[PDB]
Design an enzyme around this catalytic site. Structure first.
Site, PDB file in Angstrom:
ATOM      1  N   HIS A  49      35.201 126.014   0.417  1.00  0.00           N
ATOM      2  CA  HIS A  49      35.376 126.686   1.918  1.00  0.00           C
ATOM      3  C   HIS A  49      36.628 126.321   2.641  1.00  0.00           C
ATOM      4  O   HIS A  49      37.112 127.123   3.174  1.00  0.00           O
ATOM      5  CB  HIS A  49      34.127 126.919   2.516  1.00  0.00           C
ATOM      6  CG  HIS A  49      32.833 127.461   1.940  1.00  0.00           C
ATOM      7  ND1 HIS A  49      31.485 127.209   2.260  1.00  0.00           N
ATOM      8  CD2 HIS A  49      32.937 128.374   1.021  1.00  0.00           C
ATOM      9  CE1 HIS A  49      30.775 127.940   1.494  1.00  0.00           C
ATOM     10  NE2 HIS A  49      31.593 128.610   0.610  1.00  0.00           N
ATOM     11  N   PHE A  61      24.988 126.556 -17.705  1.00  0.00           N
ATOM     12  CA  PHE A  61      26.233 126.475 -18.641  1.00  0.00           C
ATOM     13  C   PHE A  61      27.356 127.233 -18.154  1.00  0.00           C
ATOM     14  O   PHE A  61      27.244 128.349 -17.508  1.00  0.00           O
ATOM     15  CB  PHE A  61      25.691 126.650 -19.964  1.00  0.00           C
ATOM     16  CG  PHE A  61      24.558 126.325 -20.406  1.00  0.00           C
ATOM     17  CD1 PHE A  61      23.191 126.934 -20.271  1.00  0.00           C
ATOM     18  CD2 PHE A  61      24.363 125.098 -20.935  1.00  0.00           C
ATOM     19  CE1 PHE A  61      22.138 126.137 -20.503  1.00  0.00           C
ATOM     20  CE2 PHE A  61      23.114 124.160 -21.315  1.00  0.00           C
ATOM     21  CZ  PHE A  61      21.845 125.010 -21.020  1.00  0.00           C
ATOM     22  N   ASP A  84      29.534 131.216 -11.604  1.00  0.00           N
ATOM     23  CA  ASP A  84      28.740 131.047 -13.042  1.00  0.00           C
ATOM     24  C   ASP A  84      27.665 130.140 -13.035  1.00  0.00           C
ATOM     25  O   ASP A  84      27.111 130.090 -13.987  1.00  0.00           O
ATOM     26  CB  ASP A  84      30.109 130.561 -13.842  1.00  0.00           C
ATOM     27  CG  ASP A  84      29.865 130.991 -15.433  1.00  0.00           C
ATOM     28  OD1 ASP A  84      28.910 130.364 -15.889  1.00  0.00           O
ATOM     29  OD2 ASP A  84      30.635 131.453 -16.075  1.00  0.00           O
ATOM     30  N   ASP A 126      29.327 129.535 -18.870  1.00  0.00           N
ATOM     31  CA  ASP A 126      29.039 130.578 -20.010  1.00  0.00           C
ATOM     32  C   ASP A 126      29.518 131.734 -19.768  1.00  0.00           C
ATOM     33  O   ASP A 126      29.052 132.944 -20.363  1.00  0.00           O
ATOM     34  CB  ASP A 126      27.443 130.494 -20.566  1.00  0.00           C
ATOM     35  CG  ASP A 126      26.846 130.927 -19.575  1.00  0.00           C
ATOM     36  OD1 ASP A 126      27.095 131.053 -18.485  1.00  0.00           O
ATOM     37  OD2 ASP A 126      25.288 131.200 -19.843  1.00  0.00           O
ATOM     38  N   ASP A 128      32.046 128.327  -9.615  1.00  0.00           N
ATOM     39  CA  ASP A 128      30.909 128.193  -8.713  1.00  0.00           C
ATOM     40  C   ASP A 128      29.680 129.307  -9.090  1.00  0.00           C
ATOM     41  O   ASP A 128      28.652 129.005  -9.027  1.00  0.00           O
ATOM     42  CB  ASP A 128      31.155 128.220  -7.372  1.00  0.00           C
ATOM     43  CG  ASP A 128      30.047 128.049  -6.221  1.00  0.00           C
ATOM     44  OD1 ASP A 128      29.171 128.816  -6.011  1.00  0.00           O
ATOM     45  OD2 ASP A 128      30.055 126.856  -5.553  1.00  0.00           O
ATOM     46  N   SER A 188      28.223 133.675 -17.193  1.00  0.00           N
ATOM     47  CA  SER A 188      27.322 134.509 -16.680  1.00  0.00           C
ATOM     48  C   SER A 188      27.526 135.470 -15.643  1.00  0.00           C
ATOM     49  O   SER A 188      26.886 136.492 -15.517  1.00  0.00           O
ATOM     50  CB  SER A 188      25.990 133.642 -16.442  1.00  0.00           C
ATOM     51  OG  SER A 188      26.400 132.340 -15.609  1.00  0.00           O
ATOM     52  N   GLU A 193      31.933 140.293  -2.445  1.00  0.00           N
ATOM     53  CA  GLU A 193      31.840 139.423  -1.463  1.00  0.00           C
ATOM     54  C   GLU A 193      33.069 139.585  -0.648  1.00  0.00           C
ATOM     55  O   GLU A 193      33.382 139.655   0.387  1.00  0.00           O
ATOM     56  CB  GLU A 193      31.670 137.964  -1.501  1.00  0.00           C
ATOM     57  CG  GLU A 193      31.499 137.085  -0.103  1.00  0.00           C
ATOM     58  CD  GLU A 193      32.684 136.257   0.150  1.00  0.00           C
ATOM     59  OE1 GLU A 193      33.436 136.245  -0.930  1.00  0.00           O
ATOM     60  OE2 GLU A 193      32.814 135.757   1.265  1.00  0.00           O
ATOM     61  N   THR A 227      22.611 130.735 -14.974  1.00  0.00           N
ATOM     62  CA  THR A 227      22.227 129.847 -16.128  1.00  0.00           C
ATOM     63  C   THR A 227      23.270 128.474 -15.771  1.00  0.00           C
ATOM     64  O   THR A 227      24.404 128.778 -15.042  1.00  0.00           O
ATOM     65  CB  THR A 227      22.803 130.158 -17.551  1.00  0.00           C
ATOM     66  OG1 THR A 227      24.305 130.723 -17.364  1.00  0.00           O
ATOM     67  CG2 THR A 227      22.174 131.553 -18.067  1.00  0.00           C
ATOM     68  N   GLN A 240      35.722 129.422  -7.071  1.00  0.00           N
ATOM     69  CA  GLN A 240      34.491 130.308  -6.474  1.00  0.00           C
ATOM     70  C   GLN A 240      34.246 131.364  -7.774  1.00  0.00           C
ATOM     71  O   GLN A 240      32.789 131.428  -7.699  1.00  0.00           O
ATOM     72  CB  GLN A 240      35.060 131.331  -5.513  1.00  0.00           C
ATOM     73  CG  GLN A 240      34.171 132.103  -4.764  1.00  0.00           C
ATOM     74  CD  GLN A 240      34.496 133.442  -3.920  1.00  0.00           C
ATOM     75  OE1 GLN A 240      35.670 133.667  -4.249  1.00  0.00           O
ATOM     76  NE2 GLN A 240      33.826 133.580  -2.930  1.00  0.00           N
TER      77      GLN A 240
HETATM   78  C1  HEM Z   1      33.864 134.789   1.849  1.00  0.00           C
HETATM   79  C2  HEM Z   1      33.746 133.554   0.778  1.00  0.00           C
HETATM   80  C3  HEM Z   1      34.542 132.918   0.110  1.00  0.00           C
HETATM   81  C4  HEM Z   1      36.171 133.118   0.052  1.00  0.00           C
HETATM   82  C5  HEM Z   1      36.629 133.992   0.830  1.00  0.00           C
HETATM   83  C6  HEM Z   1      33.988 131.770  -0.473  1.00  0.00           C
HETATM   84  C7  HEM Z   1      34.535 130.898  -1.345  1.00  0.00           C
HETATM   85  C8  HEM Z   1      34.227 129.938  -2.197  1.00  0.00           C
HETATM   86  C9  HEM Z   1      34.976 128.938  -2.849  1.00  0.00           C
HETATM   87  C10 HEM Z   1      36.681 128.956  -2.902  1.00  0.00           C
HETATM   88  C11 HEM Z   1      33.991 128.060  -3.368  1.00  0.00           C
HETATM   89  C12 HEM Z   1      34.474 126.952  -4.433  1.00  0.00           C
HETATM   90  C13 HEM Z   1      35.873 126.526  -4.651  1.00  0.00           C
HETATM   91  C14 HEM Z   1      33.051 128.358  -2.939  1.00  0.00           C
HETATM   92  C15 HEM Z   1      31.834 127.741  -3.314  1.00  0.00           C
HETATM   93  C16 HEM Z   1      30.413 128.416  -2.894  1.00  0.00           C
HETATM   94  N1  HEM Z   1      30.113 129.170  -1.749  1.00  0.00           N
HETATM   95 FE1  HEM Z   1      31.307 130.673  -1.124  1.00  0.00          FE
HETATM   96  N2  HEM Z   1      32.700 131.859  -0.236  1.00  0.00           N
HETATM   97  C17 HEM Z   1      32.302 132.944   0.754  1.00  0.00           C
HETATM   98  C18 HEM Z   1      30.963 133.313   1.270  1.00  0.00           C
HETATM   99  C19 HEM Z   1      29.840 132.531   0.904  1.00  0.00           C
HETATM  100  C20 HEM Z   1      28.516 132.702   1.546  1.00  0.00           C
HETATM  101  C21 HEM Z   1      27.980 133.627   2.480  1.00  0.00           C
HETATM  102  C22 HEM Z   1      27.698 131.925   0.582  1.00  0.00           C
HETATM  103  C23 HEM Z   1      26.146 131.685   1.116  1.00  0.00           C
HETATM  104  C24 HEM Z   1      25.727 130.653   2.237  1.00  0.00           C
HETATM  105  C25 HEM Z   1      24.509 130.475   2.113  1.00  0.00           C
HETATM  106  O1  HEM Z   1      24.010 129.274   2.026  1.00  0.00           O
HETATM  107  O2  HEM Z   1      23.485 131.244   2.215  1.00  0.00           O
HETATM  108  C26 HEM Z   1      28.510 130.971  -0.170  1.00  0.00           C
HETATM  109  C27 HEM Z   1      28.060 130.128  -0.840  1.00  0.00           C
HETATM  110  C28 HEM Z   1      28.812 129.296  -1.778  1.00  0.00           C
HETATM  111  C29 HEM Z   1      28.008 128.343  -2.823  1.00  0.00           C
HETATM  112  C30 HEM Z   1      26.627 128.095  -3.102  1.00  0.00           C
HETATM  113  C31 HEM Z   1      25.950 129.026  -4.205  1.00  0.00           C
HETATM  114  C32 HEM Z   1      24.677 128.577  -4.131  1.00  0.00           C
HETATM  115  O3  HEM Z   1      24.299 127.976  -5.254  1.00  0.00           O
HETATM  116  O4  HEM Z   1      23.639 129.761  -3.781  1.00  0.00           O
HETATM  117  C33 HEM Z   1      29.214 127.809  -3.654  1.00  0.00           C
HETATM  118  C34 HEM Z   1      28.935 126.613  -4.692  1.00  0.00           C
HETATM  119  N3  HEM Z   1      29.830 131.604  -0.052  1.00  0.00           N
HETATM  120  N4  HEM Z   1      32.791 129.540  -2.202  1.00  0.00           N
HETATM  121 CA    CA Z   2      26.527 130.314 -16.314  1.00  0.00          CA
END
Ligand code: HEM
Ligand code: CA
Ligand SMILES: *[C@@H]1O[C@H](CO)[C@@H](O[C@@H]2O[C@H](CO)[C@@H](O[C@H]3O[C@H](CO)[C@@H](O)[C@H](O)[C@@H]3O)[C@H](O)[C@H]2NC(C)=O)[C@H](O)[C@H]1NC(C)=O
Ligand SMILES: *[C@@H]1O[C@H](CO)[C@@H](O[C@@H]2O[C@H](CO)[C@@H](O[C@H]3O[C@H](CO)[C@@H](O)[C@H](O)[C@@H]3O)[C@H](O)[C@H]2NC(C)=O)[C@H](O)[C@H]1NC(C)=O
Ligand SMILES: *[C@@H]1O[C@H](CO)[C@@H](O[C@@H]2O[C@H](CO)[C@@H](O)[C@H](O)[C@H]2NC(C)=O)[C@H](O)[C@H]1NC(C)=O
Ligand SMILES: *[C@@H]1O[C@H](CO)[C@@H](O[C@@H]2O[C@H](CO)[C@@H](O)[C@H](O)[C@H]2NC(C)=O)[C@H](O)[C@H]1NC(C)=O
Length: 595
Positions: free
Chosen positions: A351, A186, A110, A188, A108, A190, A258, A184, A105
């Protein structure tokens, strides 16, 4: 022809050129093409977008246009039928710590963010969408199926607003709709420093030349720091307990509060910066406010990269690691470092790894108090629990001693995320992350499951039995096929995650390919990758290899016992050694002799 130009609404400046430090926005990384990888530009497209009207309307929108001759199923019914379950017993991943989930997370956050559209710092659309479920403009409601309990107690739908998109904001046309990445590309860090110049400055301690990051002034954690609180009112972390009134935290990425176990990691990270900066100032007393800042900041980004490539990826890809991410060979300026639109869905496998409770452990790793373990759903936007209930330590120990959930085909996403999610805008703990993910695929215009299988050079099932073989599950294959009518229509999020796991990995063939592909690219496309010759000296590199997530905990909290391998499942106290036995980062190669 290409349309090439659209370099409109985005922050631009001058390439410091030859500067040994990344820019905040990611600009100037690739010299011949300066905006590759930068925050506030469109998600890359590996495959052309698939929208209902070709250009921008998602599948499901016009209630009478099919996708492939068929009606795509409702997000929430795909949720109720396939993604839900009720028994949490048996679910724990027997060889992965709860930190396995937690790191995915941070990585992700970053790399990618597709924010929601606003258009109302007051507006009846952020309330005509929640109050009447009227589809229209950027309101794209998740309607409830007949028989969904939630009808009885919540309303006709879960509101949902389409994602932002490049070029303008207002009602838009011409090209296919392309979603923005506000972060970003990378690795990095962020998520710690910000992706914008302004937010980056607010974050810094600029009252003194030690290059420190701002720290909360109202509350302390055994004399160790917490993140600053946020100006922002109203504040959802406040709304969660009006008696306590503890605001959300201010970090380089907006999502930091969050959930509590994510605010924790953010705070171990801030703490690492400031630590690095003091230590550095001791060695090189003539260094700068700015110089201390960037140098600590460059060590940190090396950190996030090393734990990511060395400790976390080998155990997500498994045996497929060697085939998508081969050993490093140098920066390749032709490799495109941009995060792809599909990655932001593939990376949502994590998730299915979130378990249903969060524990707090005391010094011998015993249940801290009488209310030790809590339902994950009371921890969304909950900061009052760190500040007023033991700070960070009791909550970092739980990360080392407890386990992530194991993806399993009959149990996919716990109800805590599936029925009870708090969205920081609306009032209830009653959303569904699974349906949202699905509605989100559609909004972002994703090709179906077979398109991606095609993309990864893997077979594309066309029939029940084929789907049965690919998934090695008769029943799952049957539900999917009853809801979708053809595998061509299976949304990538639910298809990707339905595959059985590759050997020693935690995602399947389709998922190993899209992730593996993304990671190779952001490492090969990064001028500042830590092993990129000439970015750290050979002796600095030797120093950086000794870093580990364990040490980070030792140096930044009062935990004295930790695992050596921290992502694997670990039993207390057999697997826990003393901090002293854990390699320290040796900062002496950063010494700067004047004469
Ligand atoms: C609460 C939330 C989490 C933990 C209890 C959780 C966890 C993760 C993990 C472990 C991920 C990868 C290992 C991961 C990736 C991405 N998530 Fe996240 N997440 C929780 C809650 C949310 C919510 C709400 C969203 C937004 C849903 C939407 O579509 O509007 C969400 C997104 C993402 C996401 C996309 C980021 C982006 O590019 O906008 C991951 C890569 N998570 N989560
Ligand atoms: Ca970054
Ligand atoms: C729990 O998962 C562990 C995660 O790696 C695993 O231990 C690791 O096993 C893999 C092979 O499956 C090995 O990979 C390592 O090989 C050597 C280390 O001896 C290194 O040169 C490699 O770079 C790589 O790290 C390791 O032997 C081992 N790795 C670690 C970090 O210890 C366990 O087997 C799993 N537990 C069970 C019983 O499933
Ligand atoms: C809203 O936030 C409040 C915390 O800021 C919280 O109240 C606090 O929580 C418990 C009670 O459940 C108390 O903990 C213990 O405190 C004393 C020790 O000094 C004991 O004698 C008590 O018996 C108790 O076990 C906190 O002191 C209490 N504080 C206050 C001011 O009420 C609420 O629980 C939160 N409510 C929700 C809905 O989440
Ligand atoms: C910015 O940095 C300065 C220097 O560390 C901080 O000032 C110190 O903070 C602590 C806690 O209040 C105390 O020991 C002193 O009040 C300060 N010491 C010195 C050397 O003056 C300051 O709090 C930081 N500001 C922010 C916003 O984080
Ligand atoms: C850097 O990576 C690029 C990007 O893929 C490579 O460019 C390819 O060059 C190979 C020959 O090795 C051709 O077969 C491909 O058709 C080219 N593809 C693209 C997209 O340009 C290149 O191999 C790499 N360069 C170096 C020196 O490593």
């Amino acid at each position: 022809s290409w349309e090439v130009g659209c370099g409109a609404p985005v922050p631009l400046v001058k390439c410091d050129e030859n500067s040994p430090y990344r820019t905040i926005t990611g600009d100037c990384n690739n010299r011949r093409s300066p905006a590759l990888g930068a925050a506030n530009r469109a998600l890359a497209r590996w495959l052309p977008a698939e929208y209902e009207d070709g250009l921008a309307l998602p599948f499901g929108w016009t209630q009478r246009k099919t996708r492939n001759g068929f009606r795509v199923p409702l997000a929430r019914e795909v949720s109720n039928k396939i993604v839900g379950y009720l028994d949490e017993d048996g679910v724990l991943d027997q060889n992965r710590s709860l930190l396995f989930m937690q790191w995915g997370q941070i990585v992700d956050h970053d790399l990618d963010f597709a924010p929601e559209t606003e258009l109302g710092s007051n507006e009846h659309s952020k309330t005509q969408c929640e109050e009447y479920c009227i589809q229209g403009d950027n309101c794209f409601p998740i309607m409830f199926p007949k028989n969904d309990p939630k009808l009885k107690t919540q309303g006709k739908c879960m509101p949902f607003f389409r994602a932002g998109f490049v070029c303008p904001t207002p009602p838009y046309q011409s090209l296919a709709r392309e979603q923005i990445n506000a972060v970003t590309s990378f690795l990095d860090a962020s998520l710690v420093y910000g992706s914008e110049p302004s937010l980056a400055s607010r974050l810094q301690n600029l009252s003194s030349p030690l290059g420190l990051m701002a720290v909360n002034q109202e509350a302390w954690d055994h004399g160790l720091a917490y993140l600053p609180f946020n100006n922002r009112k109203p504040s959802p972390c406040e709304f969660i307990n009006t008696t306590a009134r503890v605001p959300c935290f201010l970090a380089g990425d907006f999502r930091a509060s969050e959930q509590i176990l994510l605010a924790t990691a953010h705070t171990l990270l801030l703490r690492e910066h400031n630590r690095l900066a003091r230590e550095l100032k001791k060695l090189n007393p003539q260094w700068d406010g700015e110089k201390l800042y960037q140098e600590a900041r460059k060590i940190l980004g090396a950190f996030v990269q090393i734990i990511t490539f060395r400790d976390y990826l080998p155990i997500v890809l498994g045996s497929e690691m060697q085939k998508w991410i081969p050993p490093y060979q140098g920066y390749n300026n032709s490799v495109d470092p941009r995060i792809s639109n599909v990655f932001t869905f593939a990376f949502r496998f994590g998730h299915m790894e979130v378990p249903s409770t969060v524990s707090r452990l005391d010094e011998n790793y015993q249940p801290w108090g009488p209310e030790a373990e809590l339902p994950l759903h009371t921890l969304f936007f909950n900061t009052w629990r760190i500040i007023k209930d033991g700070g960070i330590d009791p909550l970092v120990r739980g990360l080392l001693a407890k386990k992530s959930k194991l993806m399993n085909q009959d149990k996919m996403v716990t109800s805590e995320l599936r029925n009870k999610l708090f969205q920081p805008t609306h009032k209830i703990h009653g959303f569904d992350l699974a349906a949202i993910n699905l509605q989100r695929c559609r909004d972002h215009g994703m090709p179906g499951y077979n398109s991606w299988r095609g993309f990864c050079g893997l077979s594309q099932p066309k029939t029940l039995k084929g789907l049965q073989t690919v998934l090695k599950n008769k029943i799952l294959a049957k539900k999917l096929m009853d809801l979708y009518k053809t595998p061509d229509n299976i949304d990538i999020w639910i298809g990707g995650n339905a595959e059985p796991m590759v050997e020693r990995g935690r995602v399947g063939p389709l998922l190993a390919c899209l992730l593996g592909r993304q990671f190779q690219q952001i490492r090969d496309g990064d001028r500042f990758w830590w092993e990129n010759p000439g970015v750290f000296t050979e002796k600095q590199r030797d120093s950086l290899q000794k870093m580990s997530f364990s040490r980070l905990i030792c140096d930044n909290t009062h935990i004295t016992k930790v695992p050596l391998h921290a992502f694997q499942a670990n039993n207390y106290p057999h697997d826990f050694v003393d901090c002293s036995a854990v390699d320290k980062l040796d900062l002496s190669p950063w010494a700067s002799r004047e004469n």
